[PDB]
Design a protein around this ligand. Structure first.
Ligand code: T7X
Ligand code: LBN
Ligand code: LBN
Ligand code: YFP
Ligand code: 6OU
Ligand code: 6OU
Ligand code: 6OU
Ligand code: 6OU
Ligand code: 6OU
Ligand code: 6OU
Ligand code: 6OU
Ligand code: 6OU
Ligand code: NA
Lengths: 456, 125
């Protein structure tokens, strides 16, 4: 039934209806048997299969399943703890969702391969969203802030150490008794340590997540950026101890890339996280297309102008690189229309320059602005959903890292009694509690667990 | 925009400054001077050969082009697009906020001139 669902309205409606009917029939015929726990060869259950395959409707039905039939009510996953006026308090099951199982629904959704249809939207189902927000509010936000602060300190130390590098001679540079030299050496050691730390963290990420090639290209951008920064740092160290003076280039690239990577920590804040998501989307689409076309035009006109120039009779503009740079200066508002005179035909030269200026400056750039406007208009909500995924991944990673400090101390929900199993024993579940208000219903005849409305 | 732009500007300024050796405008081996030189790019006055005191020209030019592409071609146009979206979104809220501003002005003016006319200018009849 899960395999047949395809997220359309009628298909989803019937799949849910038949799922419920078969569940009820199985409960009546074989009360002892637990149908939803059975697994296929891959080991997935109907819930895990639905979560992984991207069947949003079936997942939403399952997580909020509520059965009021007295004989078969333990099958429900949502319960009403109490109601006084228009106020209701409901409980969600969290049986196989709280990351305390082999592969919970939350982990399965978070670590998808981006091939699954709509993984962005599967975290909007009430229990998952509220659970993630609770986990963020309780303990992980402080850890994220601590990590951000430590990274800021690391970058400041790296910048200070690189600023005061020795300039006389070749590396390695001998230590001196000056206190400033000791501080500089300490900073260099700390920078190298941070680089190796990021290297190993990237390695372990690759090992654990076993990303696919296409996934490696299209999903893990931040991981790749941090890994590349660490690679630059390590290559810089290698060159430094090889007595080559080229280690400065690698160190500078690492410094700049780390300062840019500082942008990763904007996902702990809604506004800045959404802004960074939009930045990513623009870079991926608009910059790529515009740069392809612009580079084609620039190279064509640069070659034309270079071949026109004779350089007989800045100087020596008869170089492809120099002419390309001169034409690129036009894009940034610094173009000189008389940058050379070493040519025979002024009409040809000026016509070429004006054609380039009109094609690239007046048309392509403004068109890029318009396309960016359209893209901004189009991706208002997808950006928020992608930011939610980013924060969820951060939450899961943080919770996995600190198993030793608190393996189960910070566990969501609380153990509550929901009812009685048909065998007559008690039903105890790790439930997550929510509150709601409804003014239209005014239903005074429903199923409740507690006589007294309030909680403690 | 200013938060992101300042992050990028400081990172690339530090990179370029550490690349410069200043051996062999002058004395560009200053963080302030390099920051100003990179900021000039934003206002359409950036010089791609503002110094030659370095050992590796390719690294310098690559850094400058990366900065220019990231901040000039991407961030500014994106700011324009975001401004357009914001303008589209706040058409009526702006009028309502202006109405509040004028109402506050009215109340303050009426309170200030109690002595001149305590109840002479009273609305209704
Ligand atoms: C090159 C272009 C790559 C830029 C891509 C980019 O923006 O992804 C940002 C970079 O976050 C920074 O680390 C901040 C980096 C901002 C862009 C920096 C510019 C590139 C470095 C240039 C250094 C120049 C020095 C030489 C973070 O994505 P990310 O790993 O959380 O991946 C998310 C998310 O996790 C996935 O689920 C989504 O499927 C995926 O689409 C994506 O939204
Ligand atoms: C000391 C405590 C170290 C662990 C904290 C931590 O995870 O920070 C880390 C920063 O810190 C470092 O990586 C630098 C480590 C060297 C510290 C020297 C400077 C001291 C001032 C926090 O960073 P992270 O969240 O591990 O990863 C962020 C980027 N990925 C890997 C998630 C993509
Ligand atoms: C957390 C806090 C981190 C903030 C840290 C540092 C920021 C403040 C730096 C002020 C230093 C002034 C002294 C001075 O000019 O002489 C310099 C000594 O300065 C040093 O060596 C200090 C650098 C060490 C930084 C590592 C921190 C690790 C600690 C854990 C050498 O003499 P100079 O001739 O000035 O150098 C010429 C260099 N230029 C100007 C030509 C480029
Ligand atoms: C170093 C440690 C940092 C100190 C924590 C500051 C704090 O505590 O305040 C937050 C600030 O406000 C903001 O949004 C944006 C301001 C911070 C942006 C800096 C980006 C860093 C790169 C709550 O932000 P928030 O999640 O959007 O608020 C909740 C949300 O608005 C509900 O709608
Ligand atoms: C060479 C650049 C080609 C980029 C084209 C592109 O946007 O592909 C996107 C992926 O681009 C890549 O392959 C990036 C490769 C790794 C870069 C990390 C540093 C596809 O994503 P989408 O469907 O646009 O969302
Ligand atoms: C020149 C340097 C920068 C960019 C050049 C190539 C970018 C063209 C891709 C634009 C269309 C696109 O995003 O394809 C979408 C994604 O397709 C891909 O994943 C293929 C990207 C490989 C590009 C080489 C569709
Ligand atoms: C978008 C288009 C990208 C690439 C198209 C590749 C076509 C290259 C045609 C070669 C033109 C040519 O002969 O340029 C020669 C090579 O020019 C260069 O510096 C490298 C050219 C590679 C261009 C790739 C971008 C003459 O320059 P030289 O030998 O360094 O100095 C002469 C004394
Ligand atoms: C489009 C507008 C076409 C108007 C261009 C003609 C202006 C003056 C042409 C002229 O006198 O230069 C003449 C131009 O040389 C040529 O053979 C090319 C003429 C340019 C027309 C090409 C239009 C096709 C686009 C040569 O005289 P000089 O030795 O430069 O003295
Ligand atoms: C956008 C266009 C902006 C400015 C273009 C200048 C306006 C055309 C005036 C034509 C007068 C003319 O041909 O002057 C002659 C000189 O003309 C030239 O050297 C080349 C004229 C070609 C300009 C038209 C090309 C437009 C095509 C764009 C595609 C003789 O006067 P002199 O050289 O000052 O001694
Ligand atoms: C966005 C980022 C904002 C602030 C990040 C703070 C990190 C600062 C790292 C310190 C780099 C450093 O050592 O620069 C030193 C200090 O540079 C300065 O002028 C003040 C730096 C404060 C930057 C805050 C913005 C070397 O300059 P000096 O000692 O005046 O002249 C040398 C003869
Ligand atoms: C992106 C495009 C990267 C391709 C640009 C490399 C072309 C020239 C490299 C070159 O000449 O290396 C020479 C030495 O440069 C270096 O030591 C490192 C080269 C940096 C290229 C790799 C950067 C990857 C980002 C040029 O400097 P020189 O010794 O003054 O002569
Ligand atoms: C946007 C790009 C606009 C302009 C870039 C210039 C076009 C590349 C032409 C490559 C020829 C080349 O490597 O020339 C050589 C010189 O190259 C250099 O000095 C550094 C070349 C690196 C430019 C490519 C960096 C793009 C990466 C951006 C991120 C030898 O010719 P010469 O030094 O004139 O004597
Ligand atoms: Na200009």
């Amino acid at each position: 039934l899960v395999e047949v669902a395809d997220n359309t309205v009628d298909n989803t409606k019937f799949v849910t209806s038949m799922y419920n009917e078969i569940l009820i029939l199985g409960a009546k015929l074989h009360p002892t048997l637990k149908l939803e726990e059975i697994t296929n060869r891959k080991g997935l259950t109907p819930l895990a299969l639905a979560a992984s395959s991207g069947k949003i409707g079936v997942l939403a039905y399952i997580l909020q399943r509520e059965i009021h039939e007295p004989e078969c009510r333990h099958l429900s996953r949502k319960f009403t703890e109490w109601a006084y006026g228009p106020v209701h308090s409901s409980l969600y099951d969290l049986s196989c969702i709280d990351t305390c199982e082999k592969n919970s629904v939350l982990e399965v959704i978070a670590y998808s391969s981006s091939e699954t249809p709509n993984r962005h939207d599967m975290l909007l189902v009430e229990p998952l969203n509220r659970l993630l927000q609770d986990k963020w509010d309780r303990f992980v936000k402080r850890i994220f802030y601590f990590n951000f602060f430590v990274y800021c300190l690391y970058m400041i130390i790296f910048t200070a150490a690189a600023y005061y590098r020795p300039v006389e001679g070749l590396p390695p540079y001998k230590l001196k008794n000056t206190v400033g030299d000791y501080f500089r050496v300490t900073g260099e050691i700390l920078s190298v340590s941070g680089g190796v730390y990021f290297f190993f963290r990237g390695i372990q990420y690759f090992l654990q997540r076993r990303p696919s090639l296409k996934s490696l290209f299209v999903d893990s951008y931040s991981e790749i950026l941090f890994f590349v920064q660490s690679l630059f740092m390590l290559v810089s160290v290698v060159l430094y101890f090889s007595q080559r003076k080229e280690y400065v280039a690698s160190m500078v690239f690492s410094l700049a890339m780390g300062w840019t990577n500082m942008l990763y920590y904007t996902r702990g804040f809604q506004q800045m996280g959404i802004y960074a998501v939009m930045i990513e989307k623009m870079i991926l689409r608009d910059l790529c297309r515009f740069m392809f076309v612009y580079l084609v035009f620039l190279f064509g006109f640069s070659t034309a102008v270079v071949t026109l120039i004779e350089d007989g009779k800045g100087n020596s503009y008869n170089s492809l690189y120099s002419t390309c740079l001169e034409l690129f200066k036009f894009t940034i508002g610094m173009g000189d229309l008389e940058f050379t005179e070493n040519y025979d035909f002024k009409a040809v030269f000026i016509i070429l320059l004006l054609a380039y200026v009109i094609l690239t400056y007046i048309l392509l750039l403004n068109m890029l602005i318009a396309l960016m406007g359209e893209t901004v208009n189009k991706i208002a909500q997808e950006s928020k959903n992608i930011w939610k995924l980013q924060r969820a991944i951060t939450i899961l990673d943080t919770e996995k890292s600190f198993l030793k400090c608190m393996r189960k101390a910070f566990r969501s929900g609380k153990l509550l009694q929901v009812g009685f199993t048909p065998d007559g024993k008690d039903d105890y579940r790790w439930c997550f509690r929510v509150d709601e208000v409804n003014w239209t219903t005014w239903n005074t005849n429903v199923g409740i667990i507690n006589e007294d409305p309030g909680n403690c």
